[PDB]
Amino acid sequence: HQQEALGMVETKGLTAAIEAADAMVASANVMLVGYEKIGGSGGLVTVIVRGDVGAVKAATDAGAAAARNVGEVKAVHVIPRPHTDVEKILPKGI
Amino acid sequence: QEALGMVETKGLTAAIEAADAMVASANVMLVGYEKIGGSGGLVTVIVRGDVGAVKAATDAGAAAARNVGEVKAVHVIPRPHTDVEKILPKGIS
Amino acid sequence: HQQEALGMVETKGLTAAIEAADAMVASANVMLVGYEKIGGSGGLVTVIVRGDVGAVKAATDAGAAAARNVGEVKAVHVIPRPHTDVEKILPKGI
Amino acid sequence: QEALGMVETKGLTAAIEAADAMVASANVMLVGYEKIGGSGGLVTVIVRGDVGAVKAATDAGAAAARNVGEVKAVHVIPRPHTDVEKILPKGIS
Amino acid sequence: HQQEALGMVETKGLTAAIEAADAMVASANVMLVGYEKIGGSGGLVTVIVRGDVGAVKAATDAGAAAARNVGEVKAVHVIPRPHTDVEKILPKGI
Amino acid sequence: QEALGMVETKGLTAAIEAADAMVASANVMLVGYEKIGGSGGLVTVIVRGDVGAVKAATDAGAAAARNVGEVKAVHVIPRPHTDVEKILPKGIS
Numbered sequence: 001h002q003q004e005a006l007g008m009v010e011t012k013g014l015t016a017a018i019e020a021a022d023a024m025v026a027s028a029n030v031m032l033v034g035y036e037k038i039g040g041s042g043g044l045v046t047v048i049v050r051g052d053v054g055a056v057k058a059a060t061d062a063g064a065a066a067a068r069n070v071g072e073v074k075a076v077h078v079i080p081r082p083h084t085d086v087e088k089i090l091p092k093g094i
Numbered sequence: 095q096e097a098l099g100m101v102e103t104k105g106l107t108a109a110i111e112a113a114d115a116m117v118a119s120a121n122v123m124l125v126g127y128e129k130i131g132g133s134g135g136l137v138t139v140i141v142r143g144d145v146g147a148v149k150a151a152t153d154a155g156a157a158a159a160r161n162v163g164e165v166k167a168v169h170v171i172p173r174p175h176t177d178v179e180k181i182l183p184k185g186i187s
Numbered sequence: 188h189q190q191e192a193l194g195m196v197e198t199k200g201l202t203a204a205i206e207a208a209d210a211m212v213a214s215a216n217v218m219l220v221g222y223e224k225i226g227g228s229g230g231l232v233t234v235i236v237r238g239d240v241g242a243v244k245a246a247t248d249a250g251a252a253a254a255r256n257v258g259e260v261k262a263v264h265v266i267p268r269p270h271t272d273v274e275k276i277l278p279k280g281i
Numbered sequence: 282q283e284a285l286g287m288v289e290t291k292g293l294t295a296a297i298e299a300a301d302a303m304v305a306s307a308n309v310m311l312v313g314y315e316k317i318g319g320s321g322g323l324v325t326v327i328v329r330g331d332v333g334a335v336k337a338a339t340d341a342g343a344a345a346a347r348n349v350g351e352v353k354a355v356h357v358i359p360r361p362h363t364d365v366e367k368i369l370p371k372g373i374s
Numbered sequence: 375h376q377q378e379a380l381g382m383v384e385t386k387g388l389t390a391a392i393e394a395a396d397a398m399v400a401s402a403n404v405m406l407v408g409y410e411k412i413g414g415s416g417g418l419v420t421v422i423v424r425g426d427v428g429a430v431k432a433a434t435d436a437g438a439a440a441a442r443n444v445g446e447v448k449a450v451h452v453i454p455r456p457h458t459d460v461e462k463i464l465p466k467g468i
Numbered sequence: 469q470e471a472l473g474m475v476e477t478k479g480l481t482a483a484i485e486a487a488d489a490m491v492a493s494a495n496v497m498l499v500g501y502e503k504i505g506g507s508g509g510l511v512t513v514i515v516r517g518d519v520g521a522v523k524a525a526t527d528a529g530a531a532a533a534r535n536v537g538e539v540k541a542v543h544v545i546p547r548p549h550t551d552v553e554k555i556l557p558k559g560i561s
Contacts (some may be wrong), residue, residue, distance in 0.1 A: 006114075010107045014502050014512040015474040015541035018555065026549040035557040038106050040131035040230065043414065043506030046106045070543050071476075075107040077162050079114050089114045091106070091127045092187035100202040102258075128201050131318075131505075132230030138201040167202035169257050175213040181205065183222040193301075197294045225293050227318035227417065233293045262294040264349050266301050276301045278293070278314045279374035287389040289445075315388050318505075319417030325388040354389035356444050362400040368392065370409040380488075384481045412480050414505035420480045449481040451536050453488050463488045465480070465501045466561035 004086040006033075006079040007049040007056040009063040016071030017045035023066035028055035033087065034094040044074060048090065053080045096178060098125075098171040099141040099152035101159055104134035108163030113139045115158035116151040125178075126186040134166055140186065145172045191273040193220075193266040194236040194243040196250040203258030204232035210253035215242035220274065221281040231261060235277065240267045283365060285312075285358040286328040286339035288346055291321035295350030300326045302345035303338040312365075313373040321353055327373065332359045378460040380407075380453040381423040381430040383437040390445030391419035397440035402429035407461065408468040418448060422464065427454045470552060472499075472545040473515040473526035475533055478508035482537030487513045489532035490525040499552075500560040508540055514560065519546045 007030065009020040017035060024047065025032050033048035049059055056078050064076040081089065099122075101112040109127060116139065117124050125140035141151055149170050156168040174181045194217065196207040204222060211234065212219050220235035236246055243265050251263040268276065286309075288299040296314060303326065304311050312327035328338055336357050343355040361368045381404065383394040391409060398421065399406050407422035423433055430452050438450040455463065473496075475486040483501060490513065491498050499514035515525055523544050530542040548555045 006110070008107045008110065010105055012506065013476050013510055013541055014504050014557070015476040015543050018472070018474060018514075019543055019545065021555055022545050022549050025555070032550065032554065036106050037504060037557075038129060038131070038135040038137060039414065039505035040135035040226065041133040041228065041415065041507050042135065043504035043508060043510040044105060044135045045504065048110075071541050075105055075163060077107050077111060079111060081114065089110060089117065089124070091110075098205070100205060102200050102202040130201050130224060130230035130232065131226035132199065132322075133228050134230060135506075136200055136230040140205075167200055167258050169202050169206055171206065171209050175209050176219065180219065181208055181212070183201070183224075193297070195294045195297065197292055223293050225316060225318070225322040225324060227322035227413065228320040228415065229322065231292060231322045235297075262292055262350060264294050264298060266298060268301065276297060276304065276311070278297075285392070287392060289387050289389040317388050317411060317417035317419065318413035319386065319509075320415050321417060323387055323417040327392075354387055354445050356389050356393055358393065358396050362396050363406065367406065368395055368399070370388070370411075380484070382481045382484065384479055410480050412503060412505070412509040412511060414509035415507040416509065418479060418509045422484075449479055449537060451481050451485060453485060455488065463484060463491065463498070465484075 002052045003080050005053040005056040006081050007060040008046055008077045009060055009067055010044055010046045010075040011067050012042040012072040014045050016067040017047050019070040020063035020067035021047045024049050024059040024063035027062035028059040030055050030059040096142045097145040097148040098174050099148040100138055100169050101152055101155040102136055102138045102167035103159045104164040104166055106137050108159040109137035109139050111162040112155035112159035116141050116155040121147040122151040189239045190267050192240040192243040193268050194247040195233055195264045196247055196254055197231055197233045197262040198254050199229040199259040201232050203254040204234050206257040207250035207254035208234045211236050211246040211250035214249035215246040217242050217246040283329045284332040284335040285361050286335040287325055287356050288339055288342040289323055289325045289354035290346045291351040291353055293324050295346040296324035296326050298349040299342035299346035303328050303342040308334040309338040376426045377454050379427040379430040380455050381434040382420055382451045383434055383441055384418055384420045384449040385441050386416040386446040388419050390441040391421050393444040394437035394441035395421045398423050398433040398437035401436035402433040404429050404433040470516045471519040471522040472548050473522040474512055474543050475526055475529040476510055476512045476541035477533045478538040478540055480511050482533040483511035483513050485536040486529035486533035490515050490529040495521040496525040
């Protein structure tokens with residue numbers, strides 16, 4: 001029994017975000033939560049994933065490595081969230 | 095009525111880390127995110143609760159956010175002059 | 188019997204706009220009309236208030252003074268509008 | 282049919298001052314605002330009415346707006362080639 | 375029997391786009407398809423027209439000439455599209 | 469299942485030229501446009517179909533777009549790891 005976790009890769013543009021998502025779901029047993037468009041200078045897209053801490057750490061590292069060859073990665077981060085309400089922290093539209 | 099706390103960051107990733115850090119105490123409620131945009135790609139995380147709880151939560155959120163991204167604003171309104179529903183903007187989640 | 192008036196404080200970001208709103212409703216007997224997000228480089232939020240010319244002049248001066256300690260104030264303005272249709276001039280979504 | 286007048290400003294505050302100034306004559310009708318964004322945070326105020334009324338209103342709107350903010354564009358289309366509803370964009374208020 | 379065509383004039387701001395549209399519909403027997411707001415630094419508005427290749431070439435040249443006296447024209451382009459499904463290529467919201 | 473192709477441009481005009489060029493072969497399907505914004509005014513054209521068809525279409529789209537505007541990104545995902553519906557964002561047309 002592990003701890004749940006939230007993983008993010010924030011890129012300039014959608015193309016790099018789709019490559020980060022595909023790379024993330026391919027590298028670990030992580031579930032793709034969804035994309036979040038924030039736009040504003042750079043046109044930022046955030047790819048969010050969930051799963052075991054180790055899986056999410058490996059997936060975000062993989063997704064960022066992939067996305068960097070397509071576009072610019074602005075942020076890469078892992079939140080090891082609790083057991084219950086792992087997506088309570090996310091924004092409503094996902 | 096209740097105190098209002100805000101952390102405004104450049105990007106969503108830093109805003110989600112600020113939110114997780116802020117809700118980490120049982121007496122602080124996540125009101126929601128508000129996307130503004132501009133050069134930063136500004137996201138505002140709003141919380142409510144007791145003055146002390148909100149002061150500690152926003153200080154925690156900003157501390158966390160900063161290690162992920164850039165914090166543009168951090169503020170606490172201990173006694174909002176109108177009902178927190180009146181003072182806040184229409185779309186908030 | 189006075190003249191009705193419209194007051195605005197336009198800031199970079201929402202946090203400074205919420206502080207301007209709270210400061211405005213605290214300083215004078217002015218009603219908070221609402222916020223308007225315009226985004227685009229700076230991420231501009233406009234706080235609109237209504238009431239007596241004097242009240243609105245005092246409130247916008249107060250709101251701008253407050254908002255400047257939280258963020259950047261881009262514009263501060265008072266329109267002394269007519270008796271009838273004081274919000275006819277505003278944009279629909281408020 | 283009727284003439285079309287536009288004042289495009291950097292920001293909403295300057296656009297509201299332009300609109301108030303433009304509608305200040307009984308023969309000029311406020312079509313609406315259109316938010317565009319970009320580096321300016323562009324807002325377009327559109328009016329309609331008689332050529333003379335619209336020429337005087339847009340010149341008044343731009344004169345006013347300029348003292349509040351930056352005016353990016355001012356223009357009058359005296360005889361729009363299609364119906365004003367056809368020439369304008371779908372969402373206008 | 376000619377070939378159908380799609381014409382575009384992309385400007386910084388709406389005012390220049392409305393002048394480009396009015397100029398386009400005045401210069402040739404072209405139908406105004408609609409506007410597309412893309413925003414992001416410059417606040418780009420695209421005016422799309424359809425009709426005969428020659429008509430669309432003359433209209434876009436006219437619309438761009440007009441729009442340049444009101445604002446900044448970012449792009450001017452003509453696509454001579456097929457006979458069937460001339461608007462299949464366009465984005466849904468127009 | 470099917471390969472996924474993307475061309476991301478600064479502006480819509482270059483994106484429409486990329487799309488027209490990409491669909492110019494019967495075995496390539498236009499998924500849709502996605503507007504992102506930022507300094508570029510980014511528009512992403514997404515296509516699907518056979519690997520070879522998608523490789524040739526995105527190379528064609530980028531070749532075309534570039535003569536109209538600026539191409540920010542060009543990429544092909546030959547074997548998307550989840551269903552193409554899962555990997556793509558919710559609003560796509």
